[PDB]
Design a protein around this ligand. Sequence first.
Ligand SMILES: Nc1ncnc2c1ncn2[C@@H]1O[C@H](COP(=O)(O)OP(=O)(O)OP(=O)(O)O)[C@@H](O)[C@H]1O
Ligand SMILES: Nc1ncnc2c1ncn2[C@@H]1O[C@H](COP(=O)(O)OP(=O)(O)OP(=O)(O)O)[C@@H](O)[C@H]1O
Lengths: 415, 420
Amino acid sequence: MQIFRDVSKLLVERVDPKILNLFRLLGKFGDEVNMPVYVVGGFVRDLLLGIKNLDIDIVVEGNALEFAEYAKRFLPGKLVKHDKFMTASLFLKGGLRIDIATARLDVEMSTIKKDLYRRDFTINAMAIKLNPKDFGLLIDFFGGYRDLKEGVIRVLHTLSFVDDPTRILRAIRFEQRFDFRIEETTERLLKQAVEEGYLERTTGPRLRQELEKILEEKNPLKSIRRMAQFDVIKHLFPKTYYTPSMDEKMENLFRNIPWVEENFGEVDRFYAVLHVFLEFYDDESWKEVRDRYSLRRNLINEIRHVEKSAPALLEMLSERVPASFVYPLVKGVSNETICHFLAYLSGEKEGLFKSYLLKIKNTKLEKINGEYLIRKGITSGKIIGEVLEKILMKKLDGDTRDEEEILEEVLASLE
Amino acid sequence: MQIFRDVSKLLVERVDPKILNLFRLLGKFGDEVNMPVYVVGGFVRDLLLGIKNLDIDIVVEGNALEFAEYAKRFLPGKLVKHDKFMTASLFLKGGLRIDIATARLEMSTIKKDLYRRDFTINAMAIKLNPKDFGLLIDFFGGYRDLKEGVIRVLHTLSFVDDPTRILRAIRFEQRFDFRIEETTERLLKQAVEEGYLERTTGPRLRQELEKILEEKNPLKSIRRMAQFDVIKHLFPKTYYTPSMDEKMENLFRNIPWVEENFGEVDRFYAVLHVFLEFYDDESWKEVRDRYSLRRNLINEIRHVEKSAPALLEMLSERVPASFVYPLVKGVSNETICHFLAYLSGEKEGLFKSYLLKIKNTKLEKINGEYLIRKGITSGKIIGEVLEKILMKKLDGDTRDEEEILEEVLASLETEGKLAA
Ligand SMILES: Nc1ncnc2c1ncn2[C@@H]1O[C@H](COP(=O)(O)OP(=O)(O)OP(=O)(O)O)[C@@H](O)[C@H]1O
Ligand SMILES: Nc1ncnc2c1ncn2[C@@H]1O[C@H](COP(=O)(O)OP(=O)(O)OP(=O)(O)O)[C@@H](O)[C@H]1O
């Protein structure tokens, strides 16, 4: 196919001038220090799709470090060097990070081709040359341009997933972000690497990251679902079986995470999802998952809390009951515990349980009473904190005045 | 002779990064709109000389306006377009703006554009398009002349074409401590004698002249101008004699001092004070009209040439302060210098101390006006009696009210009512 294309006009019309100007300069600096300068990866992809990107990757043929020190000279910002693998990032204003790398060991200067070929999918393996001579040059050896037109996710070569099974995850994320489809050959390859154990063959940490990145997408459920279609989940969490049920939970989970965030703050989605994936895990199967990925040791208790009390919750919800009855179930629990509870309901029940949650957040108001009256009268320890709890509940449902309710339960519990 | 050299290394080393990046961007734009882009004029001269320069003077082979318009898409600022004659200006901050013009009518049409300029060292260019980014272009041998410090017109008619360049050539001579190579010297004299300055408008000459007086040695520029007999051809009745000269010397040694105690000094006028001395009624008319001088300047100037002798015998015999006041009472700072133009040594240290006395011994402390108005009195006598007190103060004093009474008293030679 056409391998070279002029996207210079495309550049000036779609690229904000502060940024287009930075390209013209990087290109000239490249020429001044005698190195080919390319912008590569995601920006090239998004540019052709009309998507904005402010995370731009430069590849030079030469020395990133040199090239980047030479650039700092003429550009305002902070330079971070990473010597071990000649690489660098220049930090510019307005969320704008410019990363520079050195391409390793087809006119000739086509060593970018060896750089491009090492990448994951064709839409992500294209390059735009920035040196003034060839300023707008779209370099596309692998048919990523057409693959953008035809909405196709495609690996560069047969051994792609075997080299990095982490791309199994990447393929699905991108195919779900853009509504593309993983082409036949890649799908056979993807399926095969999953089936054979390639994921189980890759480190927890890299899997976790690729997982988190999915959870930072617009619609993670899409990807989780697609994963389930490719048996990927079974192989990440060996005791998790993604059934109509789990998936119904996952949908509720995702529906309610906003509403939670809005009222309780940051939700760590990786933990929120694990609450679902991991329900009903035996003790042993839990340690292995908790060790493969690094999972806060108390998690399995928190999950076990939700999976144990869920029918009771459901039950209380039907039969609308006194808020004080559900309090013990949401006591001092993570936003993920709350999310996990919400995973279990929809419609009327859902909102109903919402209102309880609010009633609990907001009505923690013990107000006038402040623990003084308690150790003013005689008290020690645990009793202090049990009278304080009985006062608390009485409020949630109705109310008394200041402390009739206090002497109500020191003389009701006195019995 | 070598025309092309590569000053790109010198560019990154000497030019400010904001500006360099401008230069690179500008070159890059030209390539995008198919126009050769050069930086020209004095920036090139100054770069080469290590002298700071912010002027961004640009010439393109294509169309200043289309170019300037294209550049504006990517550069924040006001675009003024000098639509007649195809020039533009791109306005940016820091005191910074880009002047873009069209290389008038091989890429080496810049040669024709470089050929119209004044002197070799101002006739160069640096190309900016990325393929030739730091490329010096010296068809006319401005590098050689820059290094040898030589002022040399580009061709034979240069002075006939623009007599302004005669004053320019001197100005530069003295700014860079350069000298005017002989053929340009011979060629200038010729242009001056044949009467070419007078053939070209007053403003144009006036501007070049004010410009000369802002430079490093105005004195030097003037004695030099005198050598080529240009003064005589600018102000027909000014004859640069050693009298005329020694006045000018003092003028300039004193301006610093004047400017110190009194304030800004207009050098152009401060010079004309000396040039225009002794111009008859009919001659002042012509000069004043041509260079757009103040109707009144002649008066101020005549004032000094007349009252000048009197001042000397006032300093020999250090007569009390009062006796000189009438002579410097409302006059301009230029007038003050004009007077100072006559004094050397101990005559000036004395005359200087007098001026300083009157400056801040105005000192009308409590006897201000309507005090005297509360006795009888009405206009123009008020002013006279007030003055006579202040005047007595210049040379010692009393209460400030005892003196007014000694003076109304002295009044009775006559005023108009009262006075036991
Ligand atoms: N695991 C991988 N295998 C092969 N190539 C990769 C891999 N990760 C990244 N790349 C290459 O690095 C480029 C940038 O990495 P990055 O994760 O930022 O990709 P991206 O396209 O920006 O994805 P995102 O938009 O999710 O940030 C990609 O466009 C791709 O060429
Ligand atoms: N009177 C003139 N005749 C011919 N060419 C001129 C004349 N004045 C200027 N030029 C050309 O245009 C350029 C810009 O004019 P300008 O007076 O700003 O020069 P400059 O070198 O910047 O000197 P200055 O220090 O006075 O700014 C000159 O350097 C010269 O190349």
